[PDB]
Amino acid sequence: QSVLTQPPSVSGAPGQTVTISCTGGSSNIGAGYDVHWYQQLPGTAPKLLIYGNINRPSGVPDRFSGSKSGTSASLAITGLQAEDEADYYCQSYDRRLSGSWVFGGGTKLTVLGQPKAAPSVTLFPPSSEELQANKATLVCLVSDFYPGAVTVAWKADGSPVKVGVETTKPSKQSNNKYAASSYLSLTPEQWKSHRSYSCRVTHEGSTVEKTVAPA
Amino acid sequence: NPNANPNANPN
Amino acid sequence: QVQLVESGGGVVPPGRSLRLSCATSGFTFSNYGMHWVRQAPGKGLEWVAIIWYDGSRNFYAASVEGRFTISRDNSKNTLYLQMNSLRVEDTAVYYCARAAYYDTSGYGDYWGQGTLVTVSSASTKGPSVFPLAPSSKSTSGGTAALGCLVKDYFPEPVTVSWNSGALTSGVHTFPAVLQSSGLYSLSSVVTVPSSSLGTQTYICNVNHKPSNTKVDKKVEPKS
DSSP, X not given: OOSBBOOSEEEEOTTOOEEEEEEOOTTTGGGTOOOEEEEEOXXXXXXXXXXXXXXXXXXSOTTEEEEEETTEEEEEXXXXXXXXXXXXXXXXXXXXXXXXXXXXXXXXXXXXXXXXXXXXEEEEOOOHHHHHTTOEEEEEEEEEEBSSOOEEEEEETTEEEOTTEEEOOOEXXXXXXXXXXXXXXXXXXXXXXXXXXXXXXXXXXXXXXXXXXXX | OTXXXXXXXXX | OOEEEEEOOOEEOXXXXXXXXXXXXXXXXXXXXXXXXXEOXXXXXXXXXXXXXXXXXXXXXXXXXXXXXXXXXXXXXXXXXXXXXXXXXXXXXXXXXXXXXXXXXXXXXXXXXXXXXXXXXXOOBOOEEEEEEEEOTTSOTTEEEEEEEEEEEBSSOOEEEEGGGTBOTTEEEOOOEEOTTSOEEEEEEEEEEGGGTTTOOOEEEEEEGGGTEEEXXXXXXXX
């Protein structure tokens, strides 16, 4: 995971204020190393948004501001405009690593242009045909959600799973809502060695969890 | 030291 | 005005080498250090390397140490990144960034547009089609969802129809995922009335022209 922790997504309506946090530790932000922020519009390269913790480049509107306290930094955006929709990254330096910079995971900002839409989740277990082919794929399909930002977490008897997870980026449907897919590839032995597997989909603070049993 | 100023001048 | 322009990206297999260039203008190139940053498709930013303004120091990320070499040609105001023993996880857009500094850490004040590097050993490959037996656990009243899993094919695209095109209402073919293996996978699911499962047959027609593979998979109810 990223050395600096950011929330994967935040959203707000036009005219509202939003904040994006950047949590670090005693070896980076906690040690006094300056924090900086970048804005990456869709399909474009990053651009400097904040430097030296609190400074705006002369070309950045005054709606963007930064601050930090202890081991955390925050980016605030007032009077949200549709043009603000982008990915936002914090950046600093870490005393434990061999590099000049270290980045946060990034935060996707959505400016609401329509009411929020919750995702529908369908979970398919491995088919008996695939298992006879000595393979096993769990299929978790997420559709009809907005903002186009979702977190998919797989569980085996309630414990997190990371190996074998392949998840798409959300793509705009025909109805201007978003869909996404996540696949968990396992071996027939792994599928049979647990009592349940779960696909947990988080969206705008709400969670939908579907579960299947090898029996 | 990779965190030292890598430029000829300050900003 | 400060301008950075990357070039040299392409598609190569693992083990191949590659040299990226970054031609600059609008400032004294020899007075500034330079950075390389990369971003895998749909992922975050990752610092790669730096070179001092005077080419006296080079620092690299652990993931590339020993394989990548950063250099510069001040006479041409150009930065370079020599990439050797490329791995599949090196696939990313590579950005040119000019070094800046504040009090206790540095940052990048100007960036290039980026150049795409794709490291893949993927070749033409037909899909493996598996049936997704009908389930009504997540559908509306009186209906059931069934589909086909089109797994591990390359390159795009594949077409998925149902009952030779006679079944179109309720079909949702999801965009494919590009797995870390370099192969694609997608799912196509159709919502049908539950009362029709005991009689009406449902068949998904998969066609992958790149490999000239065609599959008609019958999706039957579960036990």
